[PDB]
Amino acid sequence: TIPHLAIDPFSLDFFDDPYPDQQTLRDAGPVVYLDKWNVYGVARYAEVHAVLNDPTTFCSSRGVGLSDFKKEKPWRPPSLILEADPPAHTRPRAVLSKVLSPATMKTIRDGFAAAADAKVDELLQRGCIDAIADLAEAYPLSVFPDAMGLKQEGREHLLPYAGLVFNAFGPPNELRQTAIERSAPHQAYVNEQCQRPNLAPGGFGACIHAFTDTGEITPDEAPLLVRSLLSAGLDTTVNGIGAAVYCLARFPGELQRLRSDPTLARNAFEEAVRFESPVQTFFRTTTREVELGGAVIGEGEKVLMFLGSANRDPRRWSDPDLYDITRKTSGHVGFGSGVHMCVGQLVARLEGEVMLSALARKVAAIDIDGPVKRRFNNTLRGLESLPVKLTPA
Ligand code: HEM
Numbered sequence: 254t255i256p257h258l259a260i261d262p263f264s265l266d267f268f269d270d271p272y273p274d275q276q277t278l279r280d281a282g283p284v285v286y287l288d289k290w291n292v293y294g295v296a297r298y299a300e301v302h303a304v305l306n307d308p309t310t311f312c313s314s315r316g317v318g319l320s321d322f323k324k325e326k327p328w329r330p331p332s333l334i335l336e337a338d339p340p341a342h343t344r345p346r347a348v349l350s351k352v353l354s355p356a357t358m359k360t361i362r363d364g365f366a367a368a369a370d371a372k373v374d375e376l377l378q379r380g381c382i383d384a385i386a387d388l389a390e391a392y393p394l395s396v397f398p399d400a401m402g403l404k405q406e407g408r409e410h411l412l413p414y415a416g417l418v419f420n421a422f423g424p425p426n427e428l429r430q431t432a433i434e435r436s437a438p439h440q441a442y443v444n445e446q447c448q449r450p451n452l453a454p455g456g457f458g459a460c461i462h463a464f465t466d467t468g469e470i471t472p473d474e475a476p477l478l479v480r481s482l483l484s485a486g487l488d489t490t491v492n493g494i495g496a497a498v499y500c501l502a503r504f505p506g507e508l509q510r511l512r513s514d515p516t517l518a519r520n521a522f523e524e525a526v527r528f529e530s531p532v533q534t535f536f537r538t539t540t541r542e543v544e545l546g547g548a549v550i551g552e553g554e555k556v557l558m559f560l561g562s563a564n565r566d567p568r569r570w571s572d573p574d575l576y577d578i579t580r581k582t583s584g585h586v587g588f589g590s591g592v593h594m595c596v597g598q599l600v601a602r603l604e605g606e607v608m609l610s611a612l613a614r615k616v617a618a619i620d621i622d623g624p625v626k627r628r629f630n631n632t633l634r635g636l637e638s639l640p641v642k643l644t645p646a
Pocket residue numbers: 313317334335336346349353481482485486487489490492493494526530531532535586587588589590592593594595596597598600601
């Protein structure tokens with residue numbers, strides 16, 4: 254009843270061009286079985302959305318990577334938020350919601366916008382730049398570590414640590430194995446920065462520790478919650494901004510519309526998140542036998558959700574393979590959906606908005622002018638290098 258497919262969604266060939274295989278996954282049925290990894294897969298919008306919104310049946314506390322925490326030891330102590338189910342999830346989630354709230358956004362927006370404008374002005378002086386290293390990476394590195402309250406020394410560990418976290422959700426392939434082999438210095442740096450004395454006053458880290466006296470979290474929970482922001486808060490935005498710049502570089506008609514109405518910046522970023530889905534996949538584990546799309550999945554089974562495929566499913570989206578900055582994007586699953594839906598999404602959208610606003614106001618054209626190189630990661634989709642020429646407005 255359930256079709257069995259040999260597609261490896263964690264192979265380099267799949268990462269290089271996932272779209273044909275994602276269509277094969279959607280069109281084979283609402284639920285597939287991936288023989289390569291012994292997991293169920295859901296690639297259509299409807300089933301991905303259904304799984305995300307039933308956390309009781311499709312739990313996160315057995316891991317949101319391939320590994321089942323009931324069977325194997327987690328590679329690092331479980332996240333108190335991403336790898337927790339209600340009710341244990343609820344209070345840590347509330348703390349991060351308040352740390353990354355609107356009032357916080359108001360406190361950081363002017364500095365984030367000024368750093369975005371300054372980066373674009375700097376890049377325009379060079380003209381020909383790498384939109385990954387010099388923009389997608391450089392801009393978040395210029396705002397987010399400071400907003401966390403990290404010291405300067407050791408920040409070179411942040412992107413390697415995040416690449417490790419995202420590779421570690423994958424199966425035990427070479428990408429995952431190599432990341433874990435190299436992990437010790439990055440883990441040691443990150444864990445140390447999570448301690449209260451190492452987080453500067455007023456930043457996100459200090460604010461997490463300050464919530465340890467309200468009864469929502471205890472002091473011994475704060476370091477791991479800081480760890481969540483140092484895991485999820487940087488490389489995601491690198492790949493979100495990279496996705497948006499890559500979309501504007503490939504679709505100059507949309508850059509032209511954005512230049513003509515810079516207030517489209519927020520939706521242009523949201524549409525890049527749908528179109529590229531920087532976070533491609535996450536797993537859940539069934540807690541009982543369950544019927545999903547006419548299929549019967551037993552207890553204790555891993556279910557792989559293809560967020561990027563759900564975001565391009567023609568059953569849900571008109572012209573899904575077109576980048577359209579005025580698209581009604583509400584309901585895309587690039588930030589997840591339901592109780593675990595990205596708690597940092599206001600930070601991500603702020604960074605994306607102010608960078609796209611700076612481009613919309615300062616840049617007339619973005620032309621690819623060198624070889625594009627893709628970066629391979631078991632969970633993140635994005636580029637290693639994007640050579641572009643920026644023409645000033
Ligand atoms: C474009 C940027 C981003 C994308 C595409 C993204 C994507 C996601 C997705 C898909 C989830 C759902 C995980 C699940 O359902 O298992 C998630 C959750 C989460 N994200 Fe984001 N994220 C982004 C930026 C950020 C930022 C900037 C932060 C922190 C400052 C952050 C922190 C978190 C945390 C802590 C969770 C776990 C929430 C929970 O389990 O309740 N993310 N993100």
